[PDB]
Ligand binder design. Sequence first.
Ligand SMILES: CC(C)(C)c1ccc(N(C(=O)c2c[nH]cn2)[C@@H](C(=O)NC2CCCCC2)c2cccnc2)cc1
Ligand SMILES: CC(C)(C)c1ccc(N(C(=O)c2c[nH]cn2)[C@@H](C(=O)NC2CCCCC2)c2cccnc2)cc1
Lengths: 301, 297
Amino acid sequence: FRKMAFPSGKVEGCMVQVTCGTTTLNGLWLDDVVYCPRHVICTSEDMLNPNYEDLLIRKSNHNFLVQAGNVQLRVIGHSMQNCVLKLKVDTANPKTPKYKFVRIQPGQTFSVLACYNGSPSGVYQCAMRPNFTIKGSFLNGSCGSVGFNIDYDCVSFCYMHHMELPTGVHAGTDLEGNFYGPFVDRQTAQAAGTDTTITVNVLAWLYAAVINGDRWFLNRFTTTLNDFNLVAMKYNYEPLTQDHVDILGPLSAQTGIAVLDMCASLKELLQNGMNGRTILGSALLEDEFTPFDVVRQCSGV
Amino acid sequence: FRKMAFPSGKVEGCMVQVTCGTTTLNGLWLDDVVYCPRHVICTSEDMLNPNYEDLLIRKSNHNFLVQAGNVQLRVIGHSMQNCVLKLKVDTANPKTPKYKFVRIQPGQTFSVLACYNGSPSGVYQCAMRPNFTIKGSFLNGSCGSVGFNIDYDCVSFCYMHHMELPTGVHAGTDLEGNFYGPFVDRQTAQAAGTDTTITVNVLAWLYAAVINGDRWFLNRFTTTLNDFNLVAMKYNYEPLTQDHVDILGPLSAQTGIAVLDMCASLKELLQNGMNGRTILGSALLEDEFTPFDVVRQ
Ligand SMILES: CC(C)(C)c1ccc(N(C(=O)c2c[nH]cn2)[C@@H](C(=O)NC2CCCCC2)c2cccnc2)cc1
Ligand SMILES: CC(C)(C)c1ccc(N(C(=O)c2c[nH]cn2)[C@@H](C(=O)NC2CCCCC2)c2cccnc2)cc1
């Protein structure tokens, strides 16, 4: 059981470089529009309190150099949608996949294609934390990299990278420029809130463990939703809802362990630790696999 | 710090489905050649003692059904090279990337594009274990999925997947069909040898933790190389060679921590564990990042 990213080819063909004056980052080229963070028009001076509407009124089309690999794309228009800049270019991307823009919920996972200077560098599986940050691997100039899911030939873009927070976690927007989390695209003292662990994902991962070899953490007992959430609160775990329990239905049936059965196992794990054991490859309880991830991975979708 | 894989697009455009008899698996379509495990020609009771030369001589071109997405590829010739079958096809792959075939050594990392029925399922980063196995995520029909690196748009193919071993780990070949390790493409009693931790990689990852702002595991000691190895082998760590020490030189110089000083830290880490702490987000000592991977990330 590995953390698996989606194959990234459909997205690699959309990655371009966008330079505005002195700053370079990545953009997403879909049909004849390039999408990138609006903070690309910010200068090392504007950083503290940019007036983005004013900075954009200043700009003309020629202020943006867009390069797809080695071909320069002519910019014929520019506009802002919330925190994303939209550069109209004269050529539709002939590699544009079937795609949707979607906004995901905390606890949902996606693949990230990390890019630098418009060139794909690596791909990894990530999760939207409950505090709306991404524990990504992003260096300087990674802005404009996107997160995505694929559903049988359709790429659902859910994340565009904007900034790093002082704890080294990351903040970005959906592809309509709406931020995930209470963060702003300027130089400020903002910090991620206290994060919590994605309980339904830990349960899914325990089901994935049982599906493979590891069964040592199971017991004969059951808990209640109320009793378990009292422990969840103590350990800064997200509360578990009847909806979570239903989502875990398929895995409960496959394995013969009911959700509150598994909650009893996890509750024991939270207090007594793992007593030297591991569960899959990990001494930690993993929470970046969704119920759907576990079934897709254990079924070869 | 993520275990990140190479972008998979250049490899995606090469994956095809190969069918022989009732058996389907994946092939790698480069130029006018499809590469796949030769055990696609094995029958359900050939599995214990197949004679592949005899099995192959009885096949003609049209016994191989090659499908690239929706289009059937016409097989015009076939030959066997060690444990890989090479099917010559009608058409050169237009999506063929710049590529090379490389054989890697234990401890090296690579990306795997897991595929089923010729279609890519997922991508993940992997390491070749000292016992020549791969701790992969592979299900039935994964055979012929490949492992690779990419460097300056050139794809280095280093692994083709062949089989599952009893412990749940995986064995395969280079793209010339030579197995990694003492395994054979045949149903037997074979089992992976005792595995060990890739010591040079753990040290690389400790250097990565220091390049990020984490110094908590360092100490004021040093060690000789022989004393380090005598201790580390008691935890099933691979011996650290002078080659390994030279290879870490760049990370040592970037961080100002002598290689044998980092070895002293590791020795103490093995003795104490983590005491409820984390290094680069992990509660275990991570060994599937190489000195090269740390510099890149
Ligand atoms: C304009 C604005 C909003 C202040 C800004 C400035 C720099 C960047 N960062 C670029 O790397 C970058 C930006 N444009 C080209 N490159 C880095 C970044 O977030 N530093 C933050 C630290 C101080 C507080 C705000 C910025 C970065 C991003 C991702 C991974 N590691 C480092 C992101 C946003
Ligand atoms: C003919 C030969 C060499 C014995 C063979 C037989 C089956 C396969 N397995 C295919 O799934 C498969 C075969 N052809 C299409 N799919 C599986 C496999 O390895 N071992 C089984 C047979 C060998 C002995 C133990 C288990 C497999 C499962 C999961 C991930 N990886 C591979 C591989 C090789």
